[PDB]
Symmetry: D3
Subunit: 290 residues, 6 copies
């Protein structure tokens, strides 16, 4: 209210280059962290999805739900663990993971976005075979370890996916997918978002995180980088904290696969999506090909 | 081992019904043993792929009462039913939605998708495809609040028909928001009839764990193969409580313009093919009267 | 220098209006200092590109009175105005058309096209997109022939909406043929209102070189931020002659079904963004009453 | 009636793999022999065409009419003969052949199919220049012999043809076609069916015949083959009865030209088309590439 | 040898009629000497290609009475006419259909297709494009059964207009099934008028072996260049029997909404171009009155 | 009136080969000279455009206006000149040129054509960025000379242009266009017509001129040529009168760029367009590739 009108006009006017770049384009947004627990942040995130939609941009939301899965497994008395930052997934764990991600977490996000209109539609790789999985192992200090029904996205039905977007819908993706034999696997949502971004030819991949950005020499807070190329970023990979490794592996996968830029942004900031896309604050970390 | 001239005649006799159903919507209420027995559920999924590959447009509406009850038990959530409806607190809704959409519908989508890229899971929440209005129930003349239980109110018919025209088979979990965004749990039988009417379906099929409608249960000589809605409405107060929702659904759909509704025996492998492409006279057919 | 959390809130607060305008036509009357000052005209063109890149469909109707007068002076053509309209001989029409379509509209098309392939210049002559009917004016009760001056008569709404659906921004020069093919000059304010009504625009924006409607000009305490068409029609005979065409245009558009018309201050950089995506309460909003 | 219901269900269920393979695909069916004279067989054939149509399959019927042509020529007192299994065709014979095939035989089939709906449409290569002919000779013991206005299908308008099928029609093709100079030639219907099958990218070519199938060492009835590759089948060609040579030359042409399989089936069997397509009886003879 | 400025004016004078017919259906009844003489039939086929390549949509309905009679003679089938219609036994129908569709229509399709991929032969049997209803005739007041003779009953207008929109020229043989599937022979003049009305044709052209309508046959001073349907209905009982079907066809078409029907001299090379693109006043034009 | 009807029929019938060649095709017509000053010729030209339109042909009109520009500059007291047959173009001259061409000359032609229906739409390269310019110099006896804001057509938006034609419109093109930096240049209308003809894949380019045709040895009136190949025509280029050089450079550009034929036709003849397209008078000069 206190802000003079000519200043508001200038903020709107400065969005124009970014509206032109994104009009009619796909933007994949990986949604997770505390941005899915704080109620103000969640409603702002959903409003930003409706914002993109009402500018003619095509958002695609890919969500996680690690803590919600862990909580439900505890409530049911199912003992489990993690190893490479991935959840060890028995058939029993997979059923719970799928039921929490698609039947609880994805449902809340669909309903939050739909307070703005008939846009959000929940999907998994199972639906219309929209994408498939291949079982993956993880490295426990150089040795490859079986962790059950954990997968990487293998193939994606680009055409059917873009058909949802053509109808004016915002796909909300829960990261489960069948392999070639129909066995459904749990996929880390960061890696799935990168696979979807590459497959759909997205103009950008946004990854919400609970951090200011990428630090090259953590915990040295002077090591924070606003922009980095994939060559330099791949060298940091052995050095990074285990919590960032999927975020970086996803950025590398997307940008090496042709997505013009991927962005690690602070999901703790209200309207972080609008800040990243329509402002030139230099905030977060931008990854480009190099 | 069957002579080929006999197989040919079985196939040839399907032709009148292929003609009647080609390009038409068929709403199938799926539940009971057809959903839990492994032979029956695989045959049901195959029958959905069969309809799809004849150019027929199936729409599956599924239930999941026992699965919900089992999960509530595991989580220690005690609840009641009233007038056949589950008393739905916000906690019960969350579990119901998570079981129906994240477990039961998921099993059917995967079973159907073994045949091709056809099944898509949806609730009324998705693209606001349908809405709910809160309903009460009258237990001994008094209207009773049972929480977040709804009836299907409005349906985006155009969007639904676009889905089936694109060759998808909607697998519908019966949850939907009201006008204020509050998600309600809807009884799946009532929902299937509402969807059948809204989409202008040519048939409503209601899978049940019984041979058909008995006027004098359990006497198998009281079984009715075909009945009009007028007579069936008179029979309704006399029927066993387990059949009431099935009959109320058939009545609503057929009075709402669906040419026929069918209570069919879901214990029979390929019950959908038997009902649609054969003139066995099995189950109970409901027509307008 | 502005904190990022403040920029975010400015952007977030545009969302209700992005929703209201997405896919809708907005007719903008462009003239006055917004058309001559180099900072304002570049911001106006950028605002048209802004609307286009939000999926909104702007349609610009421009004036050019002073530019016409200047060219007539250079060519030695002496003429008059009557009742605010230019006495239009065939010679005056040729100059008016050449200045409006071949000079003024050309500047705006090029300014907008610095942002992309959007602007297309058109008069009613092109594809017979709209027609004129000759009008007279009454000066002291007597109806006076003022030559080839017209009002917008019929509009090919379907063709115009096809243009904007294709992502083009029509830049309209206000000239049009009558039923016999004779091209008339149309006052741009009256034309913008006629186009807004014909296209079913969601808003009509009228850029003016004033803060808004004053009931007691020049006293800035008589400024009206919102008014209904009934009260505004009563105020009309009392207003300064410079505001009469602006008010008559708003009245015609809103009585003709446009949800709201806006007299906004074209002296303000980005006046279009301010009006549409901000709730500053600036200018004068006209609604049906 | 006596057949138990669970058996009927199983027969229907076993059609599913073949319905999936043929849904949305073209199937060319060459119709001829006694299946066009017996009234029960003819109505069953037409019902099978309506069956395919009402499963979302796209049948294209190509018909012959050798005996009907011969009968009309006899009625008119026009003397003629055969040489390489092909009719010697003067201009006078061509006019009669065209009038009988398109104006009599094709008309009966169109009306039989249309008892089931508005599907069948009669066409020749003349109509919309749907296909052209090139004059062909035949070999009389190693010497090439002119037999008049007899042709092979040269080019086919694949796009216009598929447009008829897109409108939900079942083309009924009489095998006459103009050459490049407009001279209409009579084309053997077996060879024309193979040319149409190749041109339309058909999934299968079905050839109705008055025989159990292909015998490799006729008349040894133990030489009947249910499946044979084109390499092996081409070697039999000099050995075969003159009545089968067009059936085999058509199968070879279609399958070498990319049609996944061609089938010689017994047109004496009611609903032979349904038996072949939706049953795994192993009946008839299937030809595949080898 | 003709001066080029004269050719230019002949071409320029076609423009009003190109405008009237562009995108419109023209139904042409083809028969008589225009169908048998080799110069005339080649010019007729070329004129059909001409219309097609102007964006006009010709639909040809052809006859073949003498050809049918000749084939029946060769086959030894004796038959009669009654009231101008052929007594149609199943045997006569088979020959009529085989001659009309398998011989006469084939010649025209091939002649037209020398100019491009345009002509397609169809009867009412094909895709059930039109149906017949059995008709009798009254010979001296008594209604007489004449076998499988029909009138055009219903027409799939949408399917026919799809054909011409795809750039095809339908060549129609006048045979069609009734409601029970029985194919009837239809008089081609009556059929052409029924098709013209059903397709909303802009013109019906009826080629005839005469200069036009004579009120006092054979006196060439009784020739009528234009007449309204009211007066022409009064003249009908007075006309020679050979003109009756032509006049009854024009009356039916124009009373059924076709703007004009034309009896034109098929003995004249390029009679179709002369009628449509020239204002010679030749033939007889029938308009509503 | 005096002309017998069978002669009129034959004139119409002889148009048929040319109607078949042009149906559904683009024809670019450069309109200029006295055909834009004589009132009978102008109305005949507009009628010929409506004629083409009502035969299903797609005309595209490109117009000039040299004398009208010169007249307006004189009225305004702006001194200017020519050098290589091109107008020396200051910013001041460009503004007048654009205002006269688009706001006066193009307007008269649009209204003349529209007396026949809703067909003509005026456009410049500025509109929807339909085409761009690159500044060009001219040769003054072997030395390259800057003549201000004069351009050649550089790129053309073929798709957007054909969209206007698909709606049934006749584009009337005024030859102004921006360069890559937005600076609008004046383009010689002959060269622009050739660029548009090449870009749209036109079947023919027609250039109205005030001459009988191309003379190879002017003024020898026996040197008039009805047809010439581009190889031979390029050799004449150093010899020709300065007034024909753009006409020839345009024909060469169009035909070398793939337009099947370009035609220099006498704009002094009423209905010259119909004479050229639908008559085989051999009039004018036809240019083909060689
Ligand atoms: C394989 C794996 O770890 N999946 C994640 C899915 C959700 C997320 O990525 O946050 C899990 O927690 O089970
Ligand atoms: C309101 C209500 O009881 N809904 C059902 C939904 C499942 C079903 O109908 O089978 C329930 O058990 O919760
Ligand atoms: C009739 C009339 O006065 N037209 C205006 C057009 C321009 C404008 O409205 O600004 C004129 O000054 O000629
Ligand atoms: C060339 C030739 O023999 N044509 C065949 C056509 C019909 C058929 O193949 O059965 C004929 O009998 O004349
Ligand atoms: C019923 C009838 O007489 N039909 C006509 C068809 C041909 C025509 O009209 O020229 C006939 O002679 O058989
Ligand atoms: C660069 C140039 O000479 N343009 C031309 C445009 C019109 C025409 O070609 O006739 C001019 O006269 O200015």
């Amino acid at each position: 209210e206190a802000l003079p009108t000519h200043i508001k006009a200038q903020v709107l006017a400065e969005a124009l280059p970014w509206l032109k770049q994104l009009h009619g384009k796909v933007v994949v947004v990986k949604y997770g962290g505390n941005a899915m627990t704080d109620d103000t942040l969640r409603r702002a995130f959903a409003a930003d999805m409706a914002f993109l939609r009402n500018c003619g941009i095509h958002p695609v939301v890919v969500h996680g739900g690690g803590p919600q899965i862990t909580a439900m497994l505890r409530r049911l008395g199912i003992e489990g663990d993690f190893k490479g930052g991935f959840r060890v997934t028995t058939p029993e764990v997979l059923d719970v993971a799928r039921m929490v991600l698609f039947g609880q977490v994805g449902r809340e996000l669909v309903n939050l976005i739909n307070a703005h209109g008939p846009y959000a539609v929940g999907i998994t790789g199972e639906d219309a075979q929209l994408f498939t999985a291949v079982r993956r192992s993880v490295t426990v200090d150089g040795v490859a370890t079986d962790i059950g029904l954990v997968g990487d996205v293998d193939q994606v039905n680009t055409a059917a996916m873009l058909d949802l977007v053509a109808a004016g819908r915002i796909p909300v993706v829960s990261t489960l997918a069948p392999d070639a034999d129909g066995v459904v696997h749990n996929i880390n949502a960061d890696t799935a978002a990168a696979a979807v971004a590459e497959a759909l030819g997205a103009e950008k991949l946004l990854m919400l995180t609970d951090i200011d950005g990428l630090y090259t020499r953590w915990p040295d807070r002077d090591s924070l980088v606003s922009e980095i190329d994939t060559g330099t970023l791949a060298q940091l990979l052995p050095t990074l904290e285990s919590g960032m490794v999927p975020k970086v592996e996803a950025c590398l996968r997307a940008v090496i696969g042709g997505v013009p830029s991927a962005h690690i942004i602070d999901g703790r900031v209200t309207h972080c999506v609008l800040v990243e896309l329509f402002t030139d604050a230099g905030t977060g970390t931008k990854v480009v090909r190099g």
